[PDB]
Amino acid sequence: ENLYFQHMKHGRVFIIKSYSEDDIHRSIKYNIWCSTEHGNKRLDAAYRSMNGKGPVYLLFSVNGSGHFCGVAEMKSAVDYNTCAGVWSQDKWKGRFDVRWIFVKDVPNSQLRHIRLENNENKPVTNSRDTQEVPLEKAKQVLKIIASYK
Ligand SMILES: Cn1c(=O)cc(C2CC2)[nH]c1=O
Ligand SMILES: [Cl-]
């Protein structure tokens, strides 16, 4: 058995949906990310109120790809005044640090049966950018991602 993820009691988990495969590559290379203004505010509030008592996990998926591509942990608050245009499109203001934990394609078929009670019971695979995942469902997703081969 594997009862690791079943044990954590503090932590918050968010879906990250990227349109760009380049930006995923850049995120892995430099351990940084940026969301929309509204998404940045959501992640920043979750990070800051966590006050180091537990992780903020980011579950990454490219829009339309049919799979998740990996897992990262938030590693700083959001810096809103940084160099513009560093991503594939010039639509982003700011930067926060991440640490990629897992880089692996996990098909949506492995995850579509986990549904989010806070998003109308929709499959976790039908989420939008910075959709938050309830911790009990997040533990289930993390275990499937870790166990996929
Ligand atoms: C939806 N989406 C993208 O497609 C690309 C980015 C990059 C700045 C990191 N962020 C984002 O939220
Ligand atoms: Cl929860």
Swiss-Prot record:
Effect of W92A: Reduced binding to N6-methyladenosine (m6A)-containing RNAs
Top-level taxon of the source organism: Eukaryota
Post-translational modification comment from the UniProt entry: Ubiquitinated by the SCF(SKP2) complex, leading to its degradation.
Binding site residues for RNA: K17, S18, Y19, D23, W33, C34, N63, W87, W92
Induction remarks: Following heat shock stress.
Domain YTH: 11-145
Protein location: Cytoplasm, Cytosol; Cytoplasm, P-body; Cytoplasm, Stress granule; Nucleus
Tissues expressing the protein: Highly expressed in induced pluripotent stem cells (iPSCs) and down-regulated during neural differentiation.
Annotated segments matching region Interaction with m6A-containing mRNAs: 9-149
Subunit details: Interacts with CNOT1; interaction is direct and promotes recruitment of the CCR4-NOT complex. Interacts with YTHDF3. Interacts with RIDA/HRSP12; interaction leads to recruitment of the ribonuclease P/MRP complex.
Domain remark text: The disordered regions have the ability to interact with each other and to 'phase separate' into liquid droplets within the cytosol following binding to mRNAs containing multiple m6A-modified residues. This leads to the partition of m6A-containing mRNAs into membraneless compartments, where mRNAs may be stored, degraded or used to transport mRNAs to dendritic arbors in neurons.
Stated role: Specifically recognizes and binds N6-methyladenosine (m6A)-containing RNAs, and regulates their stability. M6A is a modification present at internal sites of mRNAs and some non-coding RNAs and plays a role in mRNA stability and processing. Acts as a regulator of mRNA stability by promoting degradation of m6A-containing mRNAs via interaction with the CCR4-NOT and ribonuclease P/MRP complexes, depending on the context. The YTHDF paralogs (YTHDF1, YTHDF2 and YTHDF3) share m6A-containing mRNAs targets and act redundantly to mediate mRNA degradation and cellular differentiation. (Microbial infection) Promotes viral gene expression and replication of polyomavirus SV40: acts by binding to N6-methyladenosine (m6A)-containing viral RNAs.
Entry similarity comment: Belongs to the YTHDF family. YTHDF2 subfamily.
Stated name of the protein: YTH domain-containing family protein 2
Boundaries of the shown chain within the full protein: 408 to 548 of 579
